[PDB]
Symmetry: D2
Subunit: 494 residues, 4 copies
C-alpha cells in the first residue's frame, strides 16, 4: 500500500551544506531546477563553484583531524548514526518520495516502494559493516609481529548523477561513513533537492559537522573542483563514460587521488529458445523501460533466439503499447517524463537515427504529451550490431531487439562492446546458464531475472563501464587505506 | 600412463614412529597385516598400546614447547616442508601405490592415478595455507587496540580408517602441519603400512622430531588412549558413526579436548527424468561401486524417477554385470577384494538381509572368487525406505535402487536419514538443480557428477555423519586456537 | 545519567515460553526465585523438565522447517528483527536493570550502565552480521563450479548461568538468530526473570513463533534434557567446568550434536615492576571484585613483582577496605550480595580454607551483613601456587596476591593451570607486553586493562576453560553448517 | 654461506620476449646497458617501442581468450607453475645474483642473500594463493541465489624500475599469474638483463606462450605505449611520483584501464630518547644506506630526540665513515656504485644543495672513486624541514638528521610531507609505539626495525607515494575483476 502523496511538496533546503549549516554560494549565484512533468521551475538552488568546494574540503579535512569527534568515535557508534539516519529517512519517506518524483519525474509509487526502500536497505546494510571490516594479523618471517590497520582513506569527493538521486547518494554515503571517512558530495544539477533534504537529516541524526558536506552546482565548475582538488584523497564518480575520462585525468593531473568510476552501459539481455516466454517478455520490458529507460544497466540489446523471435517481438510490442505514460503522481502511471530537455532531445535524436539506419520501428517513436518531457515507449526490431542504437547508450524508453541463432554466436556479439556493466540470460537449462554467466564480460550477470540489486551484492563495470565495485563488502575496499605495522619482538612463536 | 607395478613390494617400515625414529612396542607385541587379494600375511607390525601412545604424546608436547624449532619456524617454512614432503611422496609414487594396493586391495591403476594424485594435491594445497591464515585487527569500542592471534591448537590426536590409507593420512597432516600443530596419529590396523613409510619421508623432508608421531595398533587400545589422553588438545577422528560416539564421550570424560568427526553415510543419488541417461547410469555405477563400495559418501540410495526407472535399472544391471573383479595388480581389474575377512562377512550378511527383506536381487549376490575377499557386484531393485539395506551403511559393492514420482517426495525421502554426508542430483534443469541442492541435508551436494573432491572444497557431515569440515580453508578452523589481545592505548582513532 | 529505579519491580513473566505463548509446566510445579539482598522469595517460576523441553524442541523444529516464515525470511530482515528487539530492551531499560538487580543482586547503577548497555551493543552488533556471513566460490580442479552455502545448524540448545543473566542471554541469541537458527534456551534457576521478560519482547519484536523458546527449571532436569535430546543439533553451554564435562558426554551419548563450552577460570593478572602503580591497583581491584567476584574471567591470581609488592599490597588492602558493600539499589553501593545461599556458603568455605592453609588474611574474611548474602571484600597475601585458594575458582570477593621475581617465572606460574580463560599484563615496556601476550595460554590477554569486552572481539577458553569462541565474527562459526555444492559445467575457465 | 661469483657472467637474453620467443625490435634498434662499477657497456639490448608493445599486447590477448590453455588451466596448476619457476630461479641463483650485480651495482653478497631470497619467497608465497582467493556466496533479499566470481582483470601492463630489478619483477608476476592474468612487462632501461633471463625460465617452467611478454626499451616509448594502449586492461607502475602522474593521465585519456602506483618516498625514522641506542644507530644507518640509498622507503629523515641527539649523531658519523665502498663483487664491499651517470650527477647535485642551504656536512660529500659511479656515504646534521634535502627524494647515500623535542611535535613534522610510503619508530615504550604507529600517515610503520619486508604483509603508499598495495593477500585485489551472478530460484531459504 502506498500512502497518498503531497503532489506539491514544499522545498526546505536549497543551499550549500558545510559544517552542518546552510550557506549561499560565495558568488551568491543560483540555478533553477525544473519539474520535468511540467517544464516549470521548482525553485532556485545555490550554484556552488570552486570557492565553495574549497570551503567544503577544508571543513571535511578539519573533521578528519586525528583526535576529532569523528575520528575518536567508536566504529559501532558510526553504525548507530547510520541507523539513525535511515530511521529519519523512513519517518520522512512519503515526503522524500514525492520530492524525488517532483524533481526527477519518476512515478511516486516507484519512488516510494522502490527508491526509498533501496535507500533504507543500503544505509542499514552499511550500518552493520561499521565495526566489522577487520584488518589482519600476519605470520611474517622472522622475529616480528606484523598486522594491518584498515584506516579511512580520508576526504572523499563523491560526484553523483540524476537518475536515482537518493539511491546514488546512499550508495556513496553508506560505505564512506561506515569506514570513518569524510565527504564532499556534488549532486546532479538536474536533481539536487532530495539530497539536500537528506543533509538536514544527517545533521538531525547527530553526525559531527564537516563529516558530510554537499555542494550543488554544475559539473565543470563544482565537480571538476573536487576531482582536481589538492586535498581530496579519493574521488568516487558515477556518470557517463565521457566524464569518467575527465575525472581520471584530473586525478592524475592533480594529487594522484584514488579513483573509482561507475559509468555507462549497453547491456545485453539474452533470451534462449527454452526460456519461459511470458516471464522473459515481462522481464525484458522491465529491463529496458525501468525508470524511463534511465538506468546504466538497462537491457538495451535484447538478443532473442531465432525460433522464438517472432512471438517474443509480438508480445514485447503489445506490452510496450500498453505501458501507461502520464503524470507521475497518478497511481496508474508506469512511465513519467525524461529528466530534462537535454535528455528529451538526445533520446528523440537516437530515435531518428534508428529510423534513418533501417531498424524496424514497431511502436512509439515520438513525443507522448504536449507538455513535459514525455516520450512514447519505442521498440525497434531487426536491430543489427553496427547500428548506432545498438552501440550507443540511449538512456530512454527505446528498446532494441536483435535476432541470433547459436549460443556461441551470441556470446561473441554480446561481448563485442566497450561497455560491460551488466548482462542477463533467460533459459531453463543448467548448462546454458552456467556457460553464459561465465562467458559474458559484465560486472553483473542476471539469470532469469533483471535489475535485481541487493545491498549485499557488488555492482560495477568491466571495460569502459567503470572500475571498482559498489555495494557489498567490496564497496568498502575503495574507502580503506591499509597500513602495515611491523614490530620487532623478542622471539616469534606460532 | 601408469608405470608397471612391483607386485610384491618390500616392506621397510613396520614399527612405532616417535621423534623421527622407529621403536618396538613396549610389550614387544606385533600383529599381522593381511593382503586381502590372497588372504596371506604380508608382515607383522608393532602393536602399539596406551604406554606407546603416552611416549608419543610426550614427544609431541616437547616438540610444541615455546621456543622449540617447530614453534619458532617461519610459517612460510612450514609450507616449504609440506612441499618437500609432497615431492618425496611423488618420487616414491610407484612404490607407494603398489604398497597401497598390496595392503588395502584397491586396483593399482587407481592407487596410482587417484589416491596418490589426491595425496599430492592435498599436501601441496595445504602447504600454500601455512602463511595465509590471518588473525584479525578489530575495531573494538573505547581506547583499545584489539586483535586476534591464530595459534595452533597443540597436540592433535588423529585417528584414521583403512579405506583410503594414504589419502586419509594427508587430509589430517596437511591442515595440522600447515597451522603449526604436532600430531599423534593412529593408523588403521587393517592397512598400517603406507602411512608408516610416509613417516620415513617426514623425517627425510626435515620435520623436527616429535612433530609427527605414528602409532600403529588397535582401536580400543591405541585409539582410545589418544581419545582419553589428558594431554592431547584435539582429536580428529574418521571412521564409523558408532566409534565417533565413543570418541566424543572420551573427550568429555577426560580433558575436554576439541573434537571433529568424519563418520558414515547413506547418501542419496537422485536421478530426475530429464537427466542425461548414459551419463547418469555411468555416474550412479561409479557413485556406488568406487573403491569396492568402501567409501563413506557412496551413493547407496539411488533414487530414480518412475518414468525412467525401468530403463535405468536395465542399464545399471548390465554395467554391474560387466564390472571386472580380479587381481588388483591386473590392469583390466575394476574391482579388487574387500579389505578383510570381517568386512567380507558383514557384506555377505547385508546381501542376505536384502534378500530376506524382499528387495529384488537383480544381479550378483555371492562370493566372486576362491582366495581373498571378493564379492560380486550386487544390485537390488524396488528397494523401500524402511528396508535395512536402505538404512544402514553396507560399505561394499551392493547397490540399492528406489523409485520415486515427484521432486517434493524425493526431498523428504532423501532427507529421512540420520546420515547426511553427501547427496547428488542428476538433471538438466536449472531450477530442479537449485531446488534440490538447497533442500538436501548433506555436507556435499554433487550436481551431475559424483565423488568430485578438491583440496579446495570442504567435506564433512550433517547429522550423525560428523561434525566439522575437512579440506579447503574450513579444514584449518579446528586446528586453530584463537587468542584475543586487547591493549589499552592513549587515544583510539579510526 | 541513571534514572531512578523501581526498587521493588513487579514480575510479569514467570512461565515457560514456547511458540510465543506462556505455559505452565506439564507437571504444574513451580520453584521460588530469591532476592539475594534480603533472602526473600520474589515469586514462583514454572519448573520446566524433560516434557517441557520436548514441547519446546518440537516447536523449534517446526519453526525451522524448509519453507517456514523464519527459513524464508530475508537475512537482512533477521537483522531488522534483532535491531527491533534491541530497541524494545532500550525502551524497557530502567525496568530491566532494576529487575536484574532484584533477582541477581548486582548494583542497579551497574545493571543500568554496564549490563544493559552491553546487551544492546551485543544485539546491535549481531544484527549487522545477519546478511554478511558469506559462503565461498571455490576454484576447484576440473570442469566444475564449486561453492559453499552457510546454512544454519538448526535447533540450538543454549544453557546459561546466573552471573550476567541478560548479557549471557544476548551473547547466545545474537549469533544464533543472526544466522537463522532456532533456540531452546534454559535459563539459570537462580536468575530466570529478566530472560523471561525479554521473551515477551521477542514476541513483540515480531520473531516467528518457535524461533525462541525458553524453559526455566533446573540443571539435571531441563538442562540435561536439552543436552541429551535426540533432535537438538547443537548445544552451547556456559557454566562450570564440572558441568561442561556432563554436557560433552551427553552430546556424544545421544546424537553427536555440535558442542561449544564457555567454562570456569583462575585467571592470572600480572603486575610488572614498571607498571603504572595507581592504575594497576585500581584495575586489579576491579579485575577481582567486579560483579561480586562472580565473573568467569576474574583476576583471581594477582601476581606482583617483588620490588613493588609491599606498596601494591598496602594500596590494594586500602582499596578493598574502602569498597562499599550494601543495598544494591543504593547509589553509593559498589558491591551487592552473592547470588544465593549456596554460593554464599561456598565462598565462606574457601575463605576458611585460605586461612587454614597459611595464606595471610589482610582484610575482610567474613560475613558483611546479618541479612542477605553479603561477604566482606577479602584479600589474602603471600599466596602460594599449591594453595586451594590459588587453584580453585572461588567466584566471590576473595583476592589472592602472589609474589614473583622474574618474567620467565611468572609466565610459567601463570600457565601452570588447567584453566586458560583470560590473563592480563600491566607494564610500560613494549617487549614485555609482546613477550607475555604471546606466551600466556589464555583465550584473552588484556594489556594495561582488565575485563574489556567488546561484541567485536571473541572470548573463550584454552584448556579446561572451554572450547569455541563467543562474540565477534568467530561467534558465528558454531552456528553455521557448511554445505559444498559442486556442479559439472561445460568448460571451466578462470 | 655464499658461493663465489662469476664476476663476468655471460649474457644469454637481450631481445624482446613475446610468445615464448625472442625477437628483435621492429626498428632493429638496440640500446646499451652499462656496468655502473666501470662505466663500460655490458651489451646491447633490443630497443622496444610502440610497435613491439602492440605485438606483445596481441600475444597476451590471444593467450587470455576463453578456452585457451591458460584460461582453462586449474588454478592449483598455476600454483605448480609458479613453484616450478621459483625452483628454476633457485637452480640459477648464483648466476642471477652475479648478473644482477653486474647490471645494477649492488653487492653480490646482497644480490645472493637478499634479492634472490626475496624473489624466491615472493613467488612461492603467491604460488600458494593461486587456488585460494575465493569469491562469495551472498544472502541477498528475495528468491535469488547470488554469488561472485573472482576472474582475472585480463591483460596487465607492468612497468618496473631499476633499483631491485629481479625483486620488482617478482612482486608483479607473482600476484598477476596466481590470479590467471596475462602480462606485458616493461623493464627499466638501466637494468634489463636479469628480467630477460627470467623470461627464459618462464618458458622453461611451462607457462603457455603469451602469458608473460617482456619489452625492454625506454619509458616515453615502450612504457607510454603500454599505459596508453586501448587493449591493456590494467597497469601497475612502480617508479617516480613524477611518472606516476603521467601513467594515471594516460589511463584516463585512453581506455580507463585500472591503475595501481607504487611511487617515491621521504620516509621519517623517529628515534625516541628511550630507544636502544646501539640498535637504533645501526638500524638508522641501514634504513638510509641500504642498496646505495636506492630504496623508495629509505629512512631519509632521521628525527632524533634532543636528549640523545649528540651521541646518536657521533655514532652515526662513525658508522658512515667506516662503511666500505667498493667493487660489488668483493665480499668486503658494503656499498657499490649508483646505477648510472644520471643518478650519480643528481645525487651530487643534492649534496651541493645541502651544503648551500646550511645543513652541517658531517662526513663524505663527494665522489668515492675515479671510475664507476661511487659516492662517499654522506651525513648531514642540523637539517631543517624546509631544506630541499629534507623534502625531495635523493635516492642515494645521503643521510639527513633532524632534532626534535616532543612526540606531538615529531608527528606533525613527520606527516608534513606529500609522501607517505613508510615510517619507523624506535622506542622501548608501549604507549609511544602505539601512539606513533597510529598517528603516522604511512603505508608501513616499522617499530624498532626498518626495511622488514615479507611476502605476507602489504606495502604501498599514502598520499603521493602511490595507491593500492603489493604483497600479501592485498596484492591480489588489483588483479581481480569481480563478477556478480544473481540467479532466480524457486524459493530461497536460509
Ligand atoms: N613504491 C615502490 O615499491 C617503489 C619501488 C622501487 C622504486 N620506487 C621508486 O622508483 C623511483 C626510481 O626508479 P626509476 O628511476 O626507474 O623511476 P622512473 O619513474 O624514471 O621509471 C620507472 C619505469 O617507468 C618507465 N617510464 C619512464 N618514463 C615513462 C613514461 N613517460 N611512460 C611510461 N613509463 C615510463 C621507465 O622506463 C621505468 O621502466 C624512485 O622514485 C623510487 O622511490 C618505488
Ligand atoms: Mg552531463
Ligand atoms: Mg572397526
Ligand atoms: Mg550449578
Ligand atoms: Mg626515469
Ligand atoms: Na529537476
Ligand atoms: Na591389509
Ligand atoms: Na534470584
Ligand atoms: Na646497467
Amino acid at each position: 500500500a502506498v500512502p497518498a502523496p503531497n503532489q506539491q511538496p514544499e522545498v526546505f533546503c536549497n543551499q550549500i551544506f558545510i559544517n552542518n549549516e546552510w550557506h549561499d554560494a560565495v558568488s551568491r549565484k543560483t540555478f533553477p531546477t525544473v519539474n520535468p512533468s511540467t517544464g516549470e521551475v521548482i525553485c532556485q538552488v545555490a550554484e556552488g563553484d570552486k570557492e565553495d568546494v574549497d570551503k567544503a574540503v577544508k571543513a571535511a579535512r578539519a573533521a578528519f583531524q586525528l583526535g576529532s569527534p569523528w575520528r575518536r568515535m567508536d566504529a559501532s557508534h558510526r553504525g548507530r548514526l547510520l541507523n539513525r539516519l535511515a530511521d529519519l529517512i523512513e519517518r520522512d519517506r512519503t515526503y522524500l518520495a514525492a520530492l524525488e518524483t517532483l524533481d526527477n519525474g519518476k512515478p511516486y509509487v516507484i519512488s516510494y516502494l522502490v527508491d526509498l526502500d533501496m535507500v533504507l536497505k543500503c544505509l542499514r546494510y552499511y550500518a552493520g559493516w561499521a565495526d566489522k571490516y577487520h584488518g589482519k594479523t600476519i605470520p611474517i618471517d622472522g622475529d616480528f609481529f606484523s598486522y594491518t590497520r584498515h584506516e579511512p582513506v580520508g576526504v572523499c569527493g563523491q560526484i553523483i548523477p540524476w537518475n536515482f538521486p537518493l539511491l546514488m547518494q546512499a550508495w556513496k554515503l553508506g560505505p564512506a561513513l561506515a569506514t570513518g571517512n569524510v565527504v564532499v558530495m556534488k549532486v546532479a544539477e538536474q536533481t539536487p533537492l532530495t539530497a539536500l533534504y537528506v543533509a538536514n537529516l544527517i545533521k538531525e541524526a547527530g553526525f559531527p559537522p564537516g563529516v558530510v558536506n554537499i555542494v550543488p552546482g554544475f559539473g565543470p565548475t563544482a565537480g571538476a573542483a573536487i576531482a582536481s582538488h589538492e586535498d581530496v584523497d579519493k574521488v568516487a564518480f558515477t556518470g557517463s563514460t565521457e566524464i569518467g575520462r575527465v575525472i581520471q585525468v584530473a586525478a592524475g593531473s592533480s594529487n594522484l587521488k584514488r579513483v573509482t568510476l561507475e559509468l555507462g552501459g549497453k547491456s545485453p539481455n539474452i533470451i534462449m529458445s527454452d526460456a519461459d516466454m511470458d516471464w522473459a517478455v515481462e522481464q525484458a520490458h522491465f529491463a529496458l523501460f525501468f525508470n524511463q529507460g534511465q538506468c546504466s544497466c538497462a537491457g538495451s540489446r535484447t538478443f532473442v533466439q531465432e525460433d522464438i523471435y517472432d512471438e517474443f517481438v509480438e508480445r514485447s510490442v503489445a506490452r510496450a503499447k500498453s505501458r501507461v505514460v502520464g503524470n507521475p503522481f497518478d497511481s496508474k502511471t508506469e512511465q513519467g517524463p525524461q529528466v530534462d530537455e537535454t535528455q528529451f532531445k538526445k533520446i528523440l535524436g537516437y530515435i531518428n537515427t534508428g529510423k534513418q539506419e533501417g531498424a524496424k520501428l514497431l511502436c512509439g517513436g515520438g513525443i507522448a504529451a504536449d507538455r513535459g518531457y514525455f516520450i512514447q515507449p519505442t521498440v525497434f526490431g531487426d536491430v543489427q550490431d553496427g547500428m548506432t542504437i545498438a552501440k550507443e547508450e540511449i538512456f530512454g524508453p527505446v528498446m532494441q531487439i536483435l535476432k541470433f541463432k547459436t549460443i556461441e554466436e551470441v556470446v561473441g556479439r554480446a561481448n563485442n562492446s566497450t561497455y560491460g556493466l551488466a548482462a542477463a540470460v533467460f533459459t531453463k537449462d543448467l548448462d546454458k546458464a552456467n556457460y553464459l554467466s561465465q562467458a559474458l564480460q559484465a560486472g553483473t550477470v542476471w539469470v532469469n531475472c533483471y535489475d535485481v540489486f541487493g545491498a549485499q551484492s557488488p555492482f560495477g563495470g568491466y571495460k569502459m563501464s567503470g572500475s571498482g565495485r559498489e555495494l557489498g563488502e567490496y564497496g568498502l575496499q575503495a574507502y580503506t587505506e591499509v597500513k602495515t605495522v611491523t614490530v620487532k619482538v623478542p622471539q616469534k612463536n606460532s
